[PDB]
Symmetry: C13
Subunit: 69 residues, 13 copies
């Protein structure tokens, strides 16, 4: 049952990565909305934000591949 | 369980991707409604944000194909 | 297992797409009500956003049909 | 197994579609309430909203019927 | 496995349909409370809303009956 | 498995009906508190709302009785 | 397998019935607090609301008894 | 199965009754805080609401205890 | 099986009673903070409320003992 | 089975007990923040509240030990 | 079962302990932010609160070890 | 089964530890934003809060290793 | 069981890590938006906060790999 091991690993990583970015991006959009001059700064905070937020889920994706292969 | 492993992966990736985009898009619509003059900036933040939020779910999808095969 | 792997894959994709569109459309309706003169740009944000929030759920349906067959 | 599969697909598609429409219609009723002049534009925005949101659930119903048959 | 199926499909259709109507009806009640003159207008949105929100749950029922009978 | 089915079907229809009525009645009570002169109007809207929300659960009940017998 | 069934049917009808009454009564208390003179009016709405809300859970309690005995 | 059943029917009836009373009592406490002169009215309304909210969970306890013995 | 039953019964009764009391106490504390002269009145409602909220969970505990022993 | 039962009974009692007083303490902290003169009164309600909220979860722990030992 | 039991007991104790502290600390941080003069008073309540919050989860951990050893 | 136990223990400890810190840190960031002069106290209050919130999750990780080894 | 073990340990660690970071990053973005001059201070809190929030999930990842290999 390595298939389920790759399913709920990549699946939970998908939910993790997507929602985390969605939260961060939304915060940037709302931030840019009321402070347009802070666009460049808030975009940088987003880019390093999603990078850290995707760290573990990517590792979970790697593990999901190691379970399959 | 190859079909189940391809169902959990693709299913959770669907929920991940769809909701994440919906969270991001809604933020832009609300932002554009507040600041129509930030239409171009917020839409750029959208496509960028959607691209990041779709990374892992798409990776979760190609895994669902590797499980099916 | 060939029917279960096509049920929770299509079921989750249904929940994914339907709710995602609902969130996006709701934002457009509320935006249009708040700012009627933005009816054009907000509706274009909808159709683009809905299309993006349907990418993976559509693939999840395609994968689901590949399970039954 | 086809009896259990067709149930989950149809069951979730029901949850998907019904809630999605409910969220959209809620926005239309609320929008029309605070802006009766925008009744027409919000109503057509509902129909195109329901149609897109009900798409995948309808497909999930077809798959459900394909599972059962 | 046919009794369980006919129950899940009908059980999830009940939850879907009842809540969907409740959300729509609540919006109609709130709107009528705010703008009593729009009672006939919002009541029409309710019936059109309920019917569309009841579509898939209704189909989920005939699928539940197809599994049972 | 017929006992388990009739249980879930009636149990989920119970959650469906009870909560749906609760949401509608709560809106009726709140609306009546806000605009008391609309007592009969909202109550009429409640009865129509309850009946429409009680539809599928009532159907899900006769399914439960059909599973038992 | 009838003990488990009669438990689920009665257990869910318990949660359904109790919470639904709580929501309706809470609205009655909040409304009575805001409008003390609408006590009897709202109390009548409560009794009618509770009766309709408890209708299906009571049926689920009967099915629970039928599953047992 | 009689043990496991009586657990669910009593455990869920516990969650049902306890939370429902909590919601009702909390509303009574908040209401009494706003309008101290409505102490007797709100308390009378509390007892009635609790009695109704506990009605079905009491039956669920009886049913569970009938499963045991 | 009597162990699993005693667990679910006592475990749910724990979650029921603890959260119920918490909600009631949280209300009494906020009520007392808001209106200090109603300290004795709200404390009585807390005790009466807790006794009613703990009624069923305690019975569920007794049942848990009846299943164990 | 006896181990699993001891887990559920103690695990749920942990979630019950911890969250219960967390709600109570948070209420006390907020109450003290607003009215620091009532710090003595509110702290009494906290301890009494915690004792009542931890009553059943502590019993659930006893059940867990009766199952284990 | 002993391993799966030691897991649930410790896992639920972790969820219980970590969240309950987070709730208390958040209240302390916000109270301190609101009233800097009460940083010492609220810190004591936090320490007392955490101790009461971790009590049962600690026992659940001890039990988890008793299941494991 | 030993791996499954080590999984649930480690997984739930991760969920517990991460989210708890997230709540505490978020409160500190919002506190620092509102009160820059209090960043010294709020950071200490964060570190103290984090250490307390990570107590049980760490032990749950230790147990996860004992189950595994 | 080693595949389900490594998956759950990695999957839940992903959900833990990603969401916890998302909450922390969002707080920093909103904080920077509210107070641009506190950018450097809040960026420090984010980096320290993320490192603490990712502590246990990373350990859970190590455990996940300590199940496979
Ligand atoms: C604190 C209050 C205590 C009240 C105690 C009330 C005692 C009188 C009520 C009847 C008790 C016995 O009720 C009975 O319980 C046991 C366990 O569930 C089961 O008993 C049944 O199975 C057991 C299995 O060994 C058989 O030995 C027994 O002949 C059979 O009747 C039945 O389910 C139920 O008929
Ligand atoms: C196996 C089943 C897996 C299901 C996974 C579903 C994950 C869905 C996560 C969605 C989280 C969205 O939270 P958010 O965008 O902050 O706002 C939510 C709205 N409020 C702020 C009002 C709460
Ligand atoms: C299994 C599937 C579960 C799906 C659950 C989906 C729940 C909803 C998802 C999140 C929807 C969006 O919320 P949000 O962006 O926080 O609100 C934004 C609104 N304001 C900006 C005004 C605050
Ligand atoms: C079987 C699984 C079924 C899951 C169903 C989940 C449905 C979730 C619906 C969630 C609707 C939320 O609406 P929204 O647009 O976020 O507005 C919220 C705006 N405020 C935050 C300001 C309130
Ligand atoms: C099977 C389980 C089904 C559960 C379904 C629960 C669905 C709950 C969805 C409704 C949650 C709230 O969102 P909403 O009222 O749309 O937003 C309100 C925002 N405005 C005020 C701006 C309109
Ligand atoms: C398994 C069974 C699960 C059933 C769960 C049912 C949950 C239903 C929750 C529905 C609650 C939301 O209601 P609504 O109409 O959107 O109003 C919300 C309007 N405001 C947000 C503006 C206040
Ligand atoms: C077995 C599972 C049972 C789950 C039951 C969950 C019930 C969820 C719905 C309960 C509340 C729905 O109230 P409503 O009328 O939408 O107004 C809500 C308006 N406010 C938000 C402002 C208060
Ligand atoms: C398995 C079942 C476990 C029990 C679940 C019971 C859930 C009951 C929830 C009932 C919630 C109270 O509803 P309401 O005051 O109409 O809205 C209040 C909504 N806000 C809190 C956001 C204001
Ligand atoms: C095993 C699962 C157990 C889950 C238990 C969940 C219990 C949730 C209880 C929620 C208590 C809510 O209180 P309420 O009366 O709606 O006040 C709301 C007051 N306002 C309307 C003004 C906001
Ligand atoms: C199996 C594990 C189940 C765990 C379930 C935990 C449920 C926790 C529910 C917590 C409900 C909190 O409600 P409350 O603070 O009275 O209302 C808040 C509204 N006011 C701010 C106006 C007071
Ligand atoms: C099996 C593991 C289950 C874990 C479940 C954990 C649930 C934690 C729930 C925490 C509830 C917090 O309540 P409270 O601080 O009174 O409300 C504060 C928030 N409102 C005022 C908006 C309502
Ligand atoms: C696997 C199980 C995972 C369960 C995870 C549950 C996480 C729940 C977190 C709930 C955190 C809520 O914080 P709180 O201090 O109550 O709100 C305080 C906010 N105000 C002060 C503004 C009211
Ligand atoms: C299966 C479990 C998946 C994980 C679910 C975890 C959900 C945690 C959500 C925590 C969100 C709450 O945040 P908080 O800090 O209370 O602030 C809220 C109060 N303010 C916004 C005013 C500051
Ligand atoms: C296995 C199941 C996985 C489910 C994962 C669900 C994760 C949900 C995380 C999102 C919850 C917290 O979001 P947030 O942005 O702090 O909003 C807090 C609410 N305000 C907008 C009002 C501040």
């Amino acid at each position: 049952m390595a298939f389920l091991g790759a399913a709920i690993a990549a699946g939970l990583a998908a939910v993790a990565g997507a929602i985390a970015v969605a939260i961060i991006v939304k915060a940037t959009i709302e931030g840019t909305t009321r402070q347009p001059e802070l666009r460049g700064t808030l975009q940088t905070l987003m880019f390093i934000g999603v990078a850290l937020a995707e760290a573990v889920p990517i590792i979970a994706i790697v593990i999901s591949l190691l379970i399959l292969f």
